[PDB]
């Protein structure tokens, strides 16, 4: 692209220098180690190069997407979640860690312990920190800013030291929620700078009564532990999502060019194909994206280009082309579909993963591209597993998680307590209501994923 733009340009050649220094930088933020790839980006990215009314470059912005959900708490022994966390633990002095009730050892925690692993054989976090610090300063994140960032993570860690000592108030079935380890619970509310009491009453007991005039809270009653631990995670998942978005956007505030203005040229980059010893819900969504990606090409390099022939005044005729495979798409969008029935099975709180799996085998196993152990007489299919045909290869998945992992629903009551905070940091994680993403608000984060990817393709099929 460069040179073709007539070479010289002080503000134009400057990016050619910084973008080369982005290699030691980009690998720090949005990258993690997979068993198949070390430099594997864990989020969809659509870079946009800006230009002027001549042809030379000037700047650019970045846009991310919904990104994997259960990679914050669940994963296989060997992989990691996100660098920003590990880079902190082996960065701050033991002195500062002790003050926050921390220690240079993930196993000691709980949230990080639920992951399964901690240390990686290929990565050296302890020795990488001081190297990253130089990259931190390269952009414009001085120690003063560094400390401000570590607090946000420390808040997450404080949430991570908060579980529920299954209150034995109830004698048999249902059960309440009580915190015996008040030390850890208090530590969070202390750093969150909110009333420890109100925090325990508002969260453990949800409030509902918003009659336009706008709510009267506090009325409630305890609920089971599963829902408590579920609502707990949803908080720690929605906090990081809005963090990463606001974090990377505030980094560009120092980087992004403000000197010039003009059009935009886009560039795409996403995670690739993978196969592990044992597949799961994670592979389903990832492989699903590939099916949408394959459709992208077909829609563009196969379909859009054909429509250009008949538009450029050329005597063209409809030549046989393999199926438009719109069935694998309509089977999971409009009413009566995969993720359309899944949405139905989600909100039915009792319809566990197993019950939903049963709804697939019966409603389908007739439409192309699906098999199991019942219909397809093949022992290779376990009774607790199912077969799924892709565009070519065959994959067997597990039904573990699915629902609770995908839902990630967090309504007001729990969020409202955080939005009305006085601290500039906490409220920062809750921007002034929908930033360029309004529509309707309440409808799970799982269904919101589909919307994020659909909004992506819509803007892909409207350019060159």
């Amino acid at each position: 692209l460069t040179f073709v733009s007539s070479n010289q340009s002080p503000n134009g050649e400057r990016i050619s220098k910084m973008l080369l220094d982005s290699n030691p930088l980009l690998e720090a933020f949005g990258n993690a180690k997979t068993l198949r790839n070390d430099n594997s980006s864990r989020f969809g990215k659509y870079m946009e190069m800006q230009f002027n009314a001549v042809g030379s470059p000037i700047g650019g912005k970045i846009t991310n997407y919904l990104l994997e959900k259960s990679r914050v708490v669940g994963r296989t022994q060997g992989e990691r979640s996100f660098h920003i966390f590990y880079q902190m633990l082996k960065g701050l002095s033991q002195s500062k860690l002790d003050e926050l009730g921390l220690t240079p050892n993930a196993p000691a925690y709980e949230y990080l312990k639920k992951s399964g692993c901690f240390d990686v054989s290929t990565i050296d976090d302890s020795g990488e920190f001081k190297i990253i610090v130089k990259a931190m300063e390269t952009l414009g994140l001085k120690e003063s800013d560094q400390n401000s960032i570590w607090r946000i993570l420390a808040a997450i860690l404080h949430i991570g030291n908060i579980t529920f000592a299954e209150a034995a108030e109830q004698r048999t079935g249902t059960t309440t929620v009580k915190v015996s380890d008040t030390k850890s619970l208090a530590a969070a509310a202390s750093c969150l700078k909110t009333d420890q009491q109100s925090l325990s009453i508002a969260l453990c007991y949800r409030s509902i009564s918003t009659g336009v005039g706008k709510r009267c809270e506090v009325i409630s009653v305890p609920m089971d532990c599963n829902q408590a631990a579920y609502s707990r995670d949803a908080l720690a998942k929605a906090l990081y999502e809005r963090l990463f978005n606001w974090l990377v956007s505030k980094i560009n505030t120092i980087i992004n060019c403000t000197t010039e203005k003009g059009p935009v040229i886009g560039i795409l980059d996403i995670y690739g194909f993978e196969v592990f010893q044992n597949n799961s819900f994670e592979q389903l969504n990832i492989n699903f994206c590939n099916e949408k990606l394959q459709q992208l090409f077909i829609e563009l390099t196969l379909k859009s280009e054909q429509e250009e022939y008949v538009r450029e005044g050329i005597e063209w005729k409809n030549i046989e082309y393999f199926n438009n495979k719109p069935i694998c798409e309509l089977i999971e969008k409009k009413p009566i579909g995969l993720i359309s029935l899944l949405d139905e099975a989600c909100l039915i709180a009792k319809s566990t993963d197993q019950t939903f799996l049963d709804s697939i085998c019966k409603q389908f196993e007739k439409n192309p591209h699906l098999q199991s152990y019942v219909v397809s007489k093949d022992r290779s299919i376990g009774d607790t597993c199912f077969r799924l045909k892709h565009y070519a290869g065959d994959v067997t998945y597990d039904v573990r998680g699915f629902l609770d992992k995908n839902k990630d629903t967090l309504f007001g009551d729990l969020i409202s307590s955080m939005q009305s905070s006085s601290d500039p940091l906490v409220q920062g994680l809750f921007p002034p209501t929908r930033p360029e993403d309004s529509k309707k608000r309440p409808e799970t984060a799982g269904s919101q994923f589909r919307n994020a990817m659909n909004a992506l393709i819509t803007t892909l099929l409207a350019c060159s």
Binding site: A167, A168, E169, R171, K178
Partner: protein
């Protein structure tokens, strides 16, 4: 008009003292009950922990009885 202003000052100053007085007594009443509420809440939890054991022991005895 001065007489009316002075009259309103009298009833206002008096009601102000009563309002402040009630605020203290109401807060005073809230405190003594809040303390008792916390003591009860704690006592209730402890008893229910024993209620668990009491049943498990009763059930264990029943299961131990079936064996014999």
């Amino acid at each position: 008009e001065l007489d009316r202003a002075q009259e309103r000052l009298a009833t206002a100053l008096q009601k102000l003292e009563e309002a402040e007085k009630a605020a203290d007594e109401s807060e005073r009443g809230m405190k003594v009950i809040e303390s008792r509420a916390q003591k009860d809440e704690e006592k209730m939890e402890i008893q229910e922990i024993q209620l668990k054991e009491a049943k498990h022991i009763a059930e264990d005895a029943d299961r131990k009885y079936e064996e014999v």
